[PDB]
Paper text:
Nef from human immunodeficiency virus (HIV) or simian immunodeficiency virus (SIV) is a 27–35 kDa viral accessory protein that is dispensable for replication but required for high infectivity and virulence.
In the presence of the longer 43-residue TCRζDP1 polypeptide SIVmac239 Nefcore crystallized in the tetragonal P43212 space group with one SIVmac239 Nefcore–TCRζDP1 heterodimer comprising the asymmetric unit. All of the twinning tests suggested that the low-resolution SIVmac239 Nefcore–TCRζDP1 crystal was not appreciably twinned, whereas the high-resolution SIVmac239 Nefcore–TCRζA63–R80 crystals were pseudo-merohedrally twinned with a twin fraction near 0.5. In order to determine the low-resolution structure of SIVmac239 Nefcore–TCRζDP1, the high-resolution SIVmac239 Nefcore–TCRζA63–R80 structure was used as the starting model for refinement and building. The TCRζDP1 peptide extends 12 residues futher at the N-terminus and 14 residues further at the C-­terminus compared with the TCRζA63–R80 polypeptide, but no additional electron density was observed beyond that seen in the SIVmac239 Nefcore–TCRζA63–R80 complex, suggesting that both the N- and C-termini of the TCRζDP1 fragment were disordered and that no additional Nef contacts were present. Surprisingly, the hydrogen-bonding network between the TCRζ polypeptide and its bound SIVmac239 Nefcore partner is seemingly absent in the tetragonal crystal form; this explains the lack of electron density calculated from the P43212 data for the N-terminus of SIVmac239 Nefcore since the PPII helix would no longer be expected to be ordered. Instead of participating in a side-chain–main-chain hydrogen bond with its bound partner, residue Gln65 in TCRζ is translocated in the tetragonal crystal form, bringing it into close enough proximity to residue Gln202 on the neighboring SIVmac239 Nefcore protein to participate in a side-chain–side-chain hydrogen bond. The main-chain–main-chain hydrogen bond between the TCRζ polypeptide and the neighboring SIVmac239 Nefcore protein is also lost in the rearranged P43212 crystal contact interface.
Author numbering:
A (entry chain A): 107 to 180, 200 to 234
B (entry chain B): 63 to 78
The structure:
Amino acid sequence: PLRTMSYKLAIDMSHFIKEKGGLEGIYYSARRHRILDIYLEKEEGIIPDWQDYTSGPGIRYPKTFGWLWKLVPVTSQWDDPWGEVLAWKFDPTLAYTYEAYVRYPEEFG
Amino acid sequence: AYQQGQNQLYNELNLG
């Protein structure tokens, strides 16, 4: 059944993936991004309108609170607009700290 | 082909 991403939704999910040894330390590509967007839709019927991040540079944080995965730095056309490398990493602080509007409040609206 | 081409992609992320 279809459904837009909610908090408890994204929340419970974030762990479900970590518990399945997913994403942690895996390298990012604009291709792999959509690869994720799709898993949620085919397996969990989640409207992929959710997955978004901060331009940066430096660390990239999710524009969907409750999401507990952040992009951290360490060519191709799915490469990085900031020429940096990015890999997924878990962080529970993002469940109680909207790092997004914290550091990049200007990227809303 | 549809469920496989989907799965092999999941693999890149440690799921499947």
